[PDB]
């Protein structure tokens, strides 16, 4: 529609998530907010094995994946972009992409702070 343009163009389907994640967090001026919120999940995937089961194990049902991510992120004051982000990835099973969205969210944040 009318979104702020990304600081630099990027690759496909994993940086296009991070470009769109940057493009909506800029209209909210929460660029430094969700970059902190993405980093907290990367340590969270380092801690719990029952959480990175929802991103690698192909036998969890796609209902149980999208319910657990919602049932955890009802609270804590996480930004409403990221709790909409993680429900988009949990419906599609693209929770593995978060490690590659974050490294593509970084250089968008780096070229915004120049």
């Amino acid at each position: 529609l009318k979104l702020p343009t990304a600081p630099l163009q990027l690759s496909g389907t994993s940086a296009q998530i991070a470009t769109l994640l940057w493009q909506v967090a800029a209209k909210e001026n929460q660029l430094d907010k969700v970059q902190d919120e993405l980093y907290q999940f990367i340590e969270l995937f380092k801690q719990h094995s029952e959480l990175r089961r929802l991103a690698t194990d192909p036998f969890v049902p796609t209902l149980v994946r999208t319910k657990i991510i919602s049932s955890v992120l009802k609270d804590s004051g996480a930004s409403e972009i990221t709790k909409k982000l993680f429900e988009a990835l949990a419906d599609e099973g693209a929770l593995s992409a978060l490690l590659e969205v974050t490294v593509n969210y970084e250089e968008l944040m780096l070229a915004h702070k120049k």
Binding site: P58, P61, T62, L63
Partner: protein, 539 residues
């Protein structure tokens, strides 16, 4: 607990099941389709998805349409209640005689019987065809195959085997029409209605045939499984009722062709000529069930299409190992006019042992094949030079083999609608004696084309003296007040008033009953609420 349609690519549907996938080969019923659509699970795709082949056409399937599992493979009626009926692939009656009363509802998917329950008892099946009973004799209880390209006479030969073998036979019969013309399926149905093989109405119990039809118009899911359905009807008679069944499969090639029509959409990369990688194992999984066990016997006659008369193609050449007697029909026998166009030097039988049919039959058959093969060797001279460089060394083999070639020809009772000659049925001892007479030299004085299209060795002399009349009538048939204009006929202009005029209108009568429809000038689409609006001007 039900599934919904995830993907539709032609005749192949992927159905997504939230918990408890169906087993492979299970039948799935699409809920809400216009015609009854049945899918059969081919594989588990991996992500709660089964991939299915549809038994009817999939035009009208919506992604998300409910699909209910039946928990079992495609189940068809079996028993006496199917006798005299025409069944679909899924056992629906398509003969408009009402529903099918069923002794049972058997699954069409089965294992081949076992090795312990195999029946190694070879006895002959006399069919009444001269070349068949001489050179590749069929086995009563065995698998028979009729190979030939398009238009050489496999359908006519299998009609001749229907009215020559299945007519005077004790047990019941199944005709599995697998992917052939619906015209000839209707022709077979009518020719068995008026013959008394299928009796309608109240005499339906006295019918001795079941038709299962999967003809060419149907999607490849139906043609791939109609042979299994007809085999299920025959396996019920073999196992449960325990009798001698006849299974006529027309064009077993179409089973493999319909498998390869969906095989690329089932996610399999293709093998050689273009067939599926699972070609031989699909063919074997069907063909190892058509066997004489110790319970009953299924003596099957299978037509095989040979695509552009190339017997090295993998779909004809794979099913050679599944048959006891192969009848290779040739085009080169056919444009000599010899019918049935059975290649004598390509048709084999396991009943060609001297232990089985005896030595005095086997020696006649081997001598006939020897004589015809030596004539085939001499044809690269006697089609070049002109039979004057043989000096009666091998020229009695040419004059013997040319009579043997015409004597293998035979008129058919089912082909009298083509041929102006009533059909013949030859006994086995009669054709043994007749071919022994030509290969020894007992009939070396007759004309050559006295042998063409005759019954047996009495009829070659009954045709020789008929031609030895009608050579004498070719000198005087003109005058003697015998073909004149007032011997036996009226005048020319009186016959124009003898006929009476039919009435012609040339208003053509098209708009007599036609209910028209005001066609939309501009195109009309659905909005988000589903209502027919015109196309919006926002381009």
């Amino acid at each position: 607990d039900a599934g919904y349609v995830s993907q539709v690519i032609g005749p192949v549907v992927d159905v997504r099941f939230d918990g408890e996938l169906p087993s492979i080969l299970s039948s799935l019923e699409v809920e809400g389709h216009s015609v009854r659509l049945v899918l059969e699970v081919a594989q588990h795709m991996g992500d709660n998805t089964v991939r299915c082949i549809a038994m009817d056409s999939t035009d009208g399937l919506v992604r998300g349409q409910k699909v209910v599992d039946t928990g079992s493979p495609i189940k068809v009626p079996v028993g006496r209640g199917t006798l005299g009926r025409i069944m679909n692939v899924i056992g629906e009656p398509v003969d408009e005689q009402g529903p099918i009363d069923a002794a049972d509802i058997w699954s069409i998917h089965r294992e081949a019987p076992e090795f312990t329950e195999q029946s190694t008892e070879q006895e002959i099946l006399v069919t009444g065809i001269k070349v068949v009973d001489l050179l590749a004799p069929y086995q009563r209880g065995g698998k028979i195959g009729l190979f030939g390209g398009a238009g050489v006479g496999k359908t006519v030969l299998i009609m001749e085997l229907i009215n020559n073998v299945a007519k005077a036979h004790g047990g019941f019969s199944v005709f599995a029409g697998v992917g052939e013309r619906t015209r000839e399926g209707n022709d077979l149905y009518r020719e068995m209605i008026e013959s008394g093989v299928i009796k309608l109405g109240a005499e339906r119990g006295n019918s001795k045939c079941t038709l299962v039809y999967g003809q060419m118009n149907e999607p490849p899911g139906a043609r791939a499984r109609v042979a299994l359905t007809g085999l299920t009807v025959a396996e019920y008679f073999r196992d449960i009722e325990g009798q001698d069944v006849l299974l006529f499969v027309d064009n077993i090639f179409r089973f493999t062709q319909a498998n390869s029509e969906v095989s690329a959409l089932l996610g399999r990369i293709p093998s050689a000529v273009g067939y599926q990688p699972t070609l031989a194992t699909d063919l074997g999984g069907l063909q190892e069930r058509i066997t004489t066990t110790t319970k009953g016997s299924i003596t099957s006659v299978q037509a095989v299409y040979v695509p552009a008369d190339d017997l090295t193609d993998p779909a004809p050449a794979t099913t050679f190992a599944h048959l006891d007697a192969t009848t290779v029909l040739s085009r080169s026998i056919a444009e000599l006019g010899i019918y049935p166009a059975v290649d004598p030097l390509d048709s084999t039988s396991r009943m060609l042992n001297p232990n089985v049919i005896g030595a005095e039959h086997y020696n006649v058959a081997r001598g006939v094949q020897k004589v015809l093969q030596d004539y085939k060797n001499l044809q690269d001279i006697i089609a070049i030079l002109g039979m004057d460089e043989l000096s009666e060394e091998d020229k009695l083999t040419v004059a013997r083999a040319r009579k043997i070639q015409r004597f293998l020809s035979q008129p058919f009772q089912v082909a009298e609608v083509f041929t102006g000659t009533p059909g013949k049925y030859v006994d086995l001892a009669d054709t043994i004696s007749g071919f022994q007479g030509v290969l020894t030299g007992k009939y070396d004085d007759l004309p050559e084309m006295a042998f063409y299209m005759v019954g047996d060795i009495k009829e070659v002399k009954e045709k020789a003296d008929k031609m030895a009349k009608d050579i004498a009538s070719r000198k005087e048939a003109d005058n003697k007040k015998v073909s004149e204009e007032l011997k036996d006929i009226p005048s020319l202009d009186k016959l124009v008033s003898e006929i009476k005029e039919v009435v012609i209108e040339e208003d053509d009568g098209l708009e007599e009953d036609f209910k028209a429809e005001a066609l939309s000038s501009e195109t009309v689409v659905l909005n988000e609420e589903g209502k027919s609006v015109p196309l919006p001007k926002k381009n």
